[PDB]
Design an enzyme around this catalytic site. Structure first.
Site, PDB file in Angstrom:
ATOM      1  N   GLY A  13      -1.710   7.240  -3.978  1.00  0.00           N
ATOM      2  CA  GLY A  13      -2.711   7.219  -5.027  1.00  0.00           C
ATOM      3  C   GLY A  13      -2.144   6.679  -6.321  1.00  0.00           C
ATOM      4  N   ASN A  14      -0.935   7.105  -6.656  1.00  0.00           N
ATOM      5  CA  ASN A  14      -0.390   6.808  -7.973  1.00  0.00           C
ATOM      6  C   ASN A  14       0.180   5.406  -8.102  1.00  0.00           C
ATOM      7  OD1 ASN A  14       1.254   9.086  -6.484  1.00  0.00           O
ATOM      8  ND2 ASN A  14       2.744   7.628  -7.339  1.00  0.00           N
ATOM      9  N   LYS A 131     -12.386  14.448   4.224  1.00  0.00           N
ATOM     10  CA  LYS A 131     -11.551  13.534   3.436  1.00  0.00           C
ATOM     11  C   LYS A 131     -12.094  13.326   2.016  1.00  0.00           C
ATOM     12  CE  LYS A 131      -8.717   9.686   3.056  1.00  0.00           C
ATOM     13  NZ  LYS A 131      -8.053   9.430   1.721  1.00  0.00           N
ATOM     14  N   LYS A 216      -4.638   7.340   5.429  1.00  0.00           N
ATOM     15  CA  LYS A 216      -3.806   6.142   5.237  1.00  0.00           C
ATOM     16  C   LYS A 216      -2.476   6.260   5.993  1.00  0.00           C
ATOM     17  CE  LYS A 216      -0.422   6.441   1.535  1.00  0.00           C
ATOM     18  NZ  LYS A 216      -0.396   7.881   1.971  1.00  0.00           N
ATOM     19  N   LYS A 273       1.133  13.619   6.309  1.00  0.00           N
ATOM     20  CA  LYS A 273       2.279  12.804   5.930  1.00  0.00           C
ATOM     21  C   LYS A 273       3.473  13.115   6.859  1.00  0.00           C
ATOM     22  CE  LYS A 273       1.348  11.531   1.088  1.00  0.00           C
ATOM     23  NZ  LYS A 273       0.078  10.964   1.658  1.00  0.00           N
TER      24      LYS A 273
END
Lengths: 311, 316
Positions: A13-14, A131, A216, A273
């Site tokens: 995101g960042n 999500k 993702k 993740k």
């Protein structure tokens, strides 16, 4: 060049949105340029790079816009929104990598590929969307949204506020696999699978879009082992995986395979993740890495981050 | 196909939009599917194919949406809207191409590339926006919205009705050219330059977007020649470029020499015409390369390729 190992890196995101920035273009652009400069280092160390990203806030603003302007322009379904975010996210990333290339007097050699990902249409995910997409609201705003538009659901996203939620089924196949491989074999820095890929089903030999947003990390893991990559690298803002204080550095498949059954990772935005790194390492024997966007090369060199390896 | 000659094909509004047709997703998809069938036949003849398109209705839509939703979500500038439209249009096109490949038990080998095109920031276009995008309006709905929307300019899209109008500066360079040539060298069917490329300028080694929509025939012509493609093909809804519309002198440009079409251009035969930039574009390709440029309709592409129809511009 032709000699480099291949690293598949899933930006977060960042790379694009920091904690509660507003999503105007320039803001995201400056974040992307910062990411690009870190990525460039990996290119310059001589690895081949496949770059992916999330699209959470970006596909959510877009679907938001489609909703808000429905009386004024035809609303687009959620897979089309996903497509449009790939264009936008892919544009930002391809351009900033061209610029960092040129700044260092290297000929630009980067592209963004629009990308479909096959999923299962009757996956459980379609009857419970989970999500989070779009920006954060308060429960005050969240409740009015649902009152206001009762098809829509918000939920609490790790103490940052409330967010609209969409179905998120597992990725099965990256349709553009062959092409992505062709490019990397050809030493192109490829950007692809932005936001996990445009969620599609394949029926009767007919690929058509379906309304979801894929994880993702799960998609990039899929992509990385499909390409038989030398590394899978998932970037965050936090230099490692941690708990409750355990800071995970290099750990073997097994020990981290053992930590996840015990929900060290059923509290974080970190579980899948970990789940995506494990599957790749499991399947390839190669190392997966979870580090900060800011220590990415340190990790590859083995100086830091959470690194997961075979036994 | 590794032996194939390369054909660069610019698809028109009718790839996606027919008659006064509404712009929902399903309607547009339906049209892409139809275009894809025709294209498949060129791939199946064994030609290498680079596919481009317009984005006028689709980018104006998207821009419409950003303006309508501005109070609830940050409004994206025109070049960023252009990027999204490549995303949308390239997705439709690739999926469609994928499907027709599969239907014919041929494995998918096709991809859309996000594409940037460099232009001149001082290009007059910036002082005189001219490209119609988005839906059509009455005269009166239009004034209603430049009082309302200061700066946002509308114009009489050719006796059909009013439309938003944006700078259309001339294309100078396809930033992804090298990658596109690499894909083509490897026999991938490449969709790119959708809408003519995201308009950008390059200053001091930095590329950055500018707010515009580039003619996609000009951009495609530029791409074809940079690629030294074997053909450039612009597909429309008319089987040929024509002269003296509605005279009994109404002639049909079929096979035609470069010199003769140039002179026709110079005398203003296509000037107040939708065929104007299309003839410019084919001329420029043929003049730069000596190769055949073709202006045809989507439904007779292969026949044009086979030299049985269409306006085929050949060198002196």
């Amino acid at each position: 060049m032709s000699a480099g190992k291949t690293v598949v890196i899933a930006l977060g995101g960042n790379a694009m949105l920091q904690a509660k920035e507003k999503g105007d273009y320039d803001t995201q652009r400056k974040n992307v340029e910062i990411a690009a400069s870190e990525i460039y280092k990996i290119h310059k160390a001589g690895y081949k790079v496949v770059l992916t990203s999330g699209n959470g806030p970006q596909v959510g603003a877009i679907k938001l816009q489609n909703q808000a302007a429905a009386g004024v322009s035809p609303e687009m379904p959620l897979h089309v929104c996903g497509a449009m975010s790939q264009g936008f996210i892919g544009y930002m990333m391809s351009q900033a990598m061209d610029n960092v290339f040129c700044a260092n007097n290297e000929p630009a050699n980067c592209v963004t590929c629009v990308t479909q990902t096959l999923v299962d249409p009757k996956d459980q995910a379609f009857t419970n969307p989970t999500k989070p997409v779009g920006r954060f609201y308060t429960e005050q705003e969240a409740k009015d949204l649902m009152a206001a538009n009762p098809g829509k659901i918000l939920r609490e996203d790790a103490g940052r506020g409330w967010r609209v939620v969409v179905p998120s089924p597992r990725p099965l196949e990256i349709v553009e696999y062959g092409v992505i491989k062709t490019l990397i074999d050809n030493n192109v820095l490829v950007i692809c699978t932005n936001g996990g890929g445009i969620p599609c089903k394949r029926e009767n030999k007919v690929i058509s879009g379906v309304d979801a947003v894929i994880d993702k990390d799960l998609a990039t893991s899929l992509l990385a082992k499909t390409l038989n990559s030398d590394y899978l690298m998932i970037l965050t803002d936090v230099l490692n995986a941690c708990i409750n204080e355990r800071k995970l550095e290099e750990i073997k498949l097994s020990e981290i395979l053992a930590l996840e059954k015990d929900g060290h990772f059923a509290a974080g935005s970190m579980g899948p993740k970990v789940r995506a790194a494990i599957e790749f390492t499991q399947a390839t024997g190669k190392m997966s890495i979870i580090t900060s966007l800011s220590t990415a090369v340190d990790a590859l060199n083995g100086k830091c981050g959470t690194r997961i390896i075979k036994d």
